[PDB]
């Protein structure tokens, strides 16, 4: 007896920029997206689901500075909130 399962479910992708566009990396300080993501994960993993954390990351790029980029969440099939519960 066989049963069906969804082929693709419970994914979220987070890319450093929008399609067609560049992402920036400082030669000594590292990649701006990676650095920004780490900082937001450190701060908000305790209180926000990963989708909300990723939105907060995008918000931090809102003003197009010298080296504008806009991180983009892609192909999301999270059916629930993913909380990391750091410390548990």
């Amino acid at each position: 007896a066989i049963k069906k399962a969804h082929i693709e479910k419970d994914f979220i992708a987070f890319c450093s920029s929008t399609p067609d566009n560049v992402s920036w990396r400082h030669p000594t300080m590292g990649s701006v997206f990676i650095g920004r993501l780490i900082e937001h994960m450190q701060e908000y993993a305790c209180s926000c689901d990963v989708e909300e954390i990723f939105r907060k990351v995008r918000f931090s790029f809102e003003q197009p500075d010298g080296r504008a980029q806009m991180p983009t969440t892609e192909r999301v099939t999270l059916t629930r909130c993913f909380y990391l519960f750091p410390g548990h």
């Binding site: 399962a5 969804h6 082929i7 693709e8 479910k9 419970d10 994914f11 979220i12 992708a13 987070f14 890319c15 450093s16 920029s17 929008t18 399609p19 067609d20 566009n21 560049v22 992402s23 990396r25 400082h26 030669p27 000594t28 300080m29 590292g30 990649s31 997206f33 990676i34 650095g35 993501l37 780490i38 994960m41 450190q42 701060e43 908000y44 993993a45 305790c46 209180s47 689901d49 990963v50 197009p64 504008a68 980029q69 806009m70 892609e74 192909r75 999270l78 629930r80 909130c81 993913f82 909380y83 990391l84 519960f85 750091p86 410390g87 548990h88």
Partner: protein
């Protein structure tokens, strides 16, 4: 370096939202895995200086979030593919509640660049291939578990801006 979720925070989250949170496994018996693939040296594209900083920070963060982190560097798209197949088969995923995949490389619109990429002869791993290899068929052990894919790469060469006067 991660702010912890207190006992008060965790239950408040388990109150605000009822049966719509991903379940997490017991700390002492779970075996969380994460994978970082970072291409820094290339045959036809400039060295990705600063990449070591990205490697350090993402490894430290994911370890501190409870993940056992594997780190693979300077790979062709075929190597990446082989490595991701091996990752998808890891029996530790059966006793995990989640996974993170981190890719950092040069990139174009099509996808992420392997170490051999050039405009002449493309060496590209597609995001489509990444999703396929971690899907319910190819990675049944992560069925119903959150799979987080992070990509540091260009997605083409446009500055990503439009000009307006004032």
């Amino acid at each position: 370096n991660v702010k912890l979720c207190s006992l008060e925070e965790a239950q408040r989250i388990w109150k605000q939202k009822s049966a719509e949170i991903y379940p997490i496994m017991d700390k002492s018996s779970r075996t969380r895995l994460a994978l970082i693939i970072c291409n820094e040296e290339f045959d036809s594209i400039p060295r990705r200086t600063g990449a070591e900083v990205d490697i350090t920070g993402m490894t430290m963060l994911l370890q501190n979030l409870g993940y056992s982190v594997d780190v693979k560097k300077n790979l062709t798209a075929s190597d990446m593919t082989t490595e991701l197949e091996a990752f998808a088969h890891r029996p530790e995923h059966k006793t995990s509640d989640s996974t993170f995949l981190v890719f950092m490389s040069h990139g174009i619109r099509e996808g992420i660049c392997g170490k051999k990429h050039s405009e002449q002869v493309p060496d590209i791993l597609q995001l489509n291939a990444i999703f396929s290899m971690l899907n319910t068929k190819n990675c049944p052990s992560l069925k119903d578990k959150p799979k987080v894919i992070i990509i540091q790469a260009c997605r083409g060469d446009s500055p990503g801006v439009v000009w307006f006067k004032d």
